[PDB]
Amino acid sequence: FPPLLSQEDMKKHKILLAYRDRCAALLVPLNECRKKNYYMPWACGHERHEYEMCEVADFQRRVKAMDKLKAEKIEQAKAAAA
Amino acid sequence: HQRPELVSFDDINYNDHKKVREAQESYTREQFIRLEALKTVRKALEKCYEESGPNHFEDCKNLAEQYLDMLPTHRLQGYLGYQRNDPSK
């Protein structure tokens, strides 16, 4: 789960917009990997996958929002005939 | 080094030609002073940017505010026109 939404840590952990989303703090274990390591694919198998699964959770709640919007538009298209 | 005294160009009745030259010299120097202030602004802005990384909105905006204010000014000297009877543009 997205644990937090900090802002001054989110500035000092010098990250950019469109990484400045939810699940943003999980880049802090990631990039600290990537510079202590050399950001190869044999760098952080677990630690990348953690942030990846958090992104998957955000994707699925976006899919639920899509469900809601399509349901509302179809119900309005139903109601407009009466 | 040396610092010539500004003459206030609009004040000396235009025959004492050494004073006229020193007035236009001084006015052009004042132009270059505001120009070098603009150069100071740009040298500050580049340091704010390369310290900021992605942090435009943090602390680098307020440079850019008076930067794009100061840039359409502080450019030319021309001549302080006599009467400005006919405007255009």
* CB pairs A-B closer than 8 Å: 9
Distances (CA, A) of B79 to B13, B28, B37, B57: 15, 10, 22, 40
Contact A14 B53 (CB under 8 A): yes
- How far apart CA B86 and CA A9 sit, in angstroms, is 59
A21 reaches B (C-beta below 8 A): no
- How far apart CA A24 and CA A16 sit, in angstroms, is 10
Chain A residue numbers with beta carbons less than 8 Å from the beta carbon of B55 are 11, 14
The domains of chain A are located at 1-82
Distances (CA, A) of A38 to A16, A34, A48: 21, 6, 14
């359409």: which residue's tokens?
B72
- How far apart CA B49 and CA B56 sit, in angstroms, is 7
If DSSP codes are grouped into helix, strand and coil, which group holds residue A34? helix
Chain B residue numbers with beta carbons less than 8 Å from the beta carbon of A14 are 53-55
Q: Give yes or no for a contact between A27 and A13, defined as CB atoms under 8 angstroms apart.
A: yes
* Resolution for this experimental structure (Å): 4.3
Neighbours of A44 (CB within 10 A): 19
Chain A residue numbers with beta carbons less than 8 Å from the beta carbon of B50 are none
Q: Give yes or no for a contact between A56 and A26, defined as CB atoms under 8 angstroms apart.
A: no
Q: Please, which residues have CB within 8 angstroms of residue B72's CB and are 6 or more apart in sequence?
A: none
Identity of residue A55: E
* Helical packing angle, A27-36 and A45-79, nearest 10°: 150
Ramachandran area for residue A39 (φ above 0: left; ψ -120 to 50: alpha; else beta):
left
* Number of domains into which chain B is organized: 1
Q: Give yes or no for a contact between B79 and A42, defined as CB atoms under 8 angstroms apart.
A: no
- How far apart CA B41 and CA B64 sit, in angstroms, is 9
Chain A residue numbers with beta carbons less than 8 Å from the beta carbon of B54 are 14-17
Residues of B with CB under 8 A from a CB of A: 53-55, 58
